[PDB]
Amino acid sequence: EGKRLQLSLDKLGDWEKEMSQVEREAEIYRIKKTQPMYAKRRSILKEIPKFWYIVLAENDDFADYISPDDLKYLEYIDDIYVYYPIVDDEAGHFKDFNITVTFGKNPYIPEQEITKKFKIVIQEDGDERIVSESVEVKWPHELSKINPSVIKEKYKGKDKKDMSAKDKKNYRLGMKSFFSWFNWTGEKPGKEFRNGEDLATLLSEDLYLNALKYYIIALSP
Amino acid sequence: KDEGKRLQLSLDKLGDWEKEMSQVEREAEIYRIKKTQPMYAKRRSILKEIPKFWYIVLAENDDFADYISPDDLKYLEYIDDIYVYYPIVDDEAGHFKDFNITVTFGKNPYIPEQEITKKFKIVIQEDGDERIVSESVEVKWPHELSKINPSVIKEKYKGDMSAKDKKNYRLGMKSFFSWFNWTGEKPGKEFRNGEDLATLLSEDLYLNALKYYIIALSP
Ligand SMILES: [Cl-]
Ligand SMILES: [Cl-]
Ligand code: NA
Ligand code: NA
Ligand code: NA
């Protein structure tokens, strides 16, 4: 009669759950097979001088997210790498990803290696959301005047609006800088780096994957 | 020239890496297809239980109705099963993207019961690219449309058509049932955008059929 529709729908629900597990396993297999190839690519790209600076400076999508003054320091990036921790952990979300930016030896920004981790959280309304943890970054020396962290420690607990005009201008400039993106979490809206999740996806899925193409375009007529 | 030769060497390494990476991605996708096809077989067995599931999915979808003549929809009421099979699983036939679509017609007075399986293959274009082609498959048309069947009219004038027969040829080439005669190597003279309809039936409507069904049965 009509209970057959209900039984078929229950079978479909169980099938959809099993299908989700199967697709997850297949995607994790692909990530595990593809991560070592990108490790090899990282090793090769470290040979090419100023590769990532050229890729980033040519890109307009990237230039929207950063201030023009920041670009000068991005010249001293030796490596951008994306690692999917599902290869090792195999216990969380398979789309979680970590972006590592390494700055080499230069007089303008101290040499360092910054690894920022991003996780996927399912919002109550169905969709996927990117969140992150703040990672400490050694800012360029010339930009220490606009570091929001220094100004925020100077105005500890004092009113959000009772800052000096100079300090407010520098705080806004520093929140517009690329280097405050490392303090982006996604759970303090209006108070963090603007559109941090979009920049994360840009660095992990378009520039990183197609970096060779953007480089070749940047060195062609 | 200190860095020119090393840049060229790095680019050669990157090219070798790109070739190996393409091979790896092909292997991973073949694994995904092999692991996912049996699940879609189980889903086909379950969906054959649900009455007029595919009619609801096809009729509610606006993307699908654009590719066909509206009158064809009347007959799509009597579709009980649509299936997609990727032959890379068993034989490594050709390109791993080859796929076969099977449409089954249930019990109805208007079009004879049948099962039509149309096979699509991928051809590597001379400039590196891929192209979709297929082989013509004979189909038992609904009775009412035999007057406009392009094969019937083409055989009548096997020698410049009459106005009625030319108009019916135009009407039938726009019909859904001439899509089974699509090959992809006769441009301007075949069914329009057959590859797009094939991809829509194989990768959007078929994969997400449950979602479109529930949407079709909601306010
Ligand atoms: Cl990936
Ligand atoms: Cl990925
Ligand atoms: Na139409
Ligand atoms: Na899907
Ligand atoms: Na509706």
Q: How many CA atoms lie within 13 A of A207 on its CB side?
A: 26
For residue B87, count other CB atoms closer than 10 A to its CB.
Answer: 17
Q: Which residue has the tokens 């208007």?
A: B110
B133 CA to centre of ligand 4 in angstroms? 24
For residue A46, give the nearest of B24, B6, B5 by alpha carbon: B6
Angle at A50 between CA A42 and CA A148, to 5 degrees: 95
Residue B157 identity: Y
Solving technique:
X-ray
A95 CA to centre of ligand 2 in angstroms? 6
Residue A20 identity: S
Q: Which residue has the tokens 């297809």?
A: B33
CA pair distance A54, A46, nearest whole angstrom? 13
* Residue A23 touches partner B, C-beta closer than 8 Å: yes
Q: Which of B49, B208, B211, B218 to mutate to test the interface with A (most CBs of A within 10 A)?
A: B49
> How far is the CA of B89 from the CAs of A88, B32, B38, B40, B201, in angstroms?
29, 10, 10, 13, 20
Q: Is the CB of residue B150 less than 8 Å from the CB of residue B136? A: no
CA pair distance A99, A115, nearest whole angstrom? 6
For residue A118, give the nearest of A139, A97, A144 by alpha carbon: A97
Max CA-CA distance within chain B?
A: 80
Q: Which residue has the tokens 């297949």?
A: A26
Q: What is the DSSP string of B23-70?
A: HHHHHHHHHHHHHHHHHHHHHHHHHTTSTTHHHHHHHH-HHHHHTS-G
Residues present in chain B in total: 219
Backbone breaks in chain B (C–N > 2.5 Å) follow which residues?
159
Phi-psi region of A116 (alpha: psi -120 to 50; beta: other; left: phi over 0): beta
Please classify residue B138 by burial: count the beta carbons closer than 10 Å to its beta carbon, then call 0-12 exposed, 13-18 middle and 19+ buried.
exposed
According to DSSP, the residues that pair with A79 across neighbouring strands are A102
Q: Is the CB of residue B137 less than 8 Å from the CB of residue B116? A: yes
* H helix or E strand, kind and range, residue A131: strand A128-132
Q: Which tokens go with B99?
A: 């796929």
- In what order do the strands lie in the sheet containing A112-122? A77-83, A97-103, A112-122, A128-132
| Spacing of C-alpha A145 from chain mean position | 25
- Residues surrounding ion ligand 4 at CB below 5 Å: B 207
Q: Which tokens go with A211?
A: 């970096």
Q: What is the DSSP letter of A166?
A: H
CA pair distance B27, B7, nearest whole angstrom? 30
Give the resolution to one decimal, in Å: 3.1
> How far is the CA of A11 from the CAs of A5, B43, B101, B209, in angstroms?
10, 9, 24, 15
